[model samples]
Target: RKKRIPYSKGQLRELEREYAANKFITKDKRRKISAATSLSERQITIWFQNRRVKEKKVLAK
Candidate 1:
């Protein structure tokens, strides 16, 4: 079983900010924000990817 990782409210806000401000920020910037917000780059990447998938699904239907 995979354990769930819970994100703090602040981190969630940061994710939204990152998503709103240039969804494809540079690697360096992504890493910086991830570190500053105490999140992993992979997590941020996955969040963005998942958001895109969600949008695509909404549009597809």
Candidate 2:
């Protein structure tokens, strides 16, 4: 199995910016994010999924 790669501060900010603008993203958009951050497209999908859940909790609380 491969080791996990952590997101850097800049990378975190990049995704956060996109998240604030829009929660759902297209597969093509994720491909762009993955290439820029050296992250896999799967990771991008998973990350956004989790982020969406977290935001929902915060907003509803």
Candidate 3:
């Protein structure tokens, strides 16, 4: 099985900022972010998806 790779605090912060600014990202933007963060595009995509779910849960609270 492949081990999970955790995101660093800095990476998480950047991702949060990006998500806050815009949940919908273009493929070009995703590629740039992936390169900047040294993370896969799939990882970035999943993070945004999960972040949205968390935001919705907080709003429903």
Candidate 4:
């Protein structure tokens, strides 16, 4: 795996918790978290986006 940048357990837990609490987080809040942590705005955005997409896919199945 050329690009195997893995997530730390804490980061994974934070993301999961945030997602569970608010499906759609505000851009301002996202930016704040991005600034404070290793996560970037785009990564968070994509994670949420992909999550919703996956939900839809699961429902379709």
Best candidate according to TM-score: 3
TM-score of each: 0.73, 0.80, 0.82, 0.68
Q: What's the CA RMSD for each of the models?
A: 2.0, 2.1, 1.5, 2.8
Worst 10 residues of 3 by lDDT: 1-10
Sort by TM-score, best first: 3, 2, 1, 4
Superposition TM-score, candidate 1 onto the true structure: 0.73
lDDT of 2 by residue, 1-61 (tens): 4576678998888788888878997877887888778877888888899898888788754
Clashing pairs in 2: none
Q: Name the weakest run of 10 consecutive residues (lDDT summed) in model 4.
A: 1-10
Ranked candidates, highest lDDT first? 3, 2, 1, 4
- Candidate 4 lDDT over 1-61, as tens digits, reads 3455666787767777777887887877687667655787878887788777776787754
Clashing pairs in 4: none
TM-score of 2: 0.80
Regions of candidate 4 where Cα sits further than 4 Å from its true position = 1-4
Clashing residue pairs in candidate 1 are: none
Once fitted onto the true fold, the runs of candidate 3 whose alpha carbons sit more than 4 angstroms away are none
lDDT of 2 at 2: 58
Full-model lDDT for every candidate: 0.77, 0.83, 0.83, 0.75
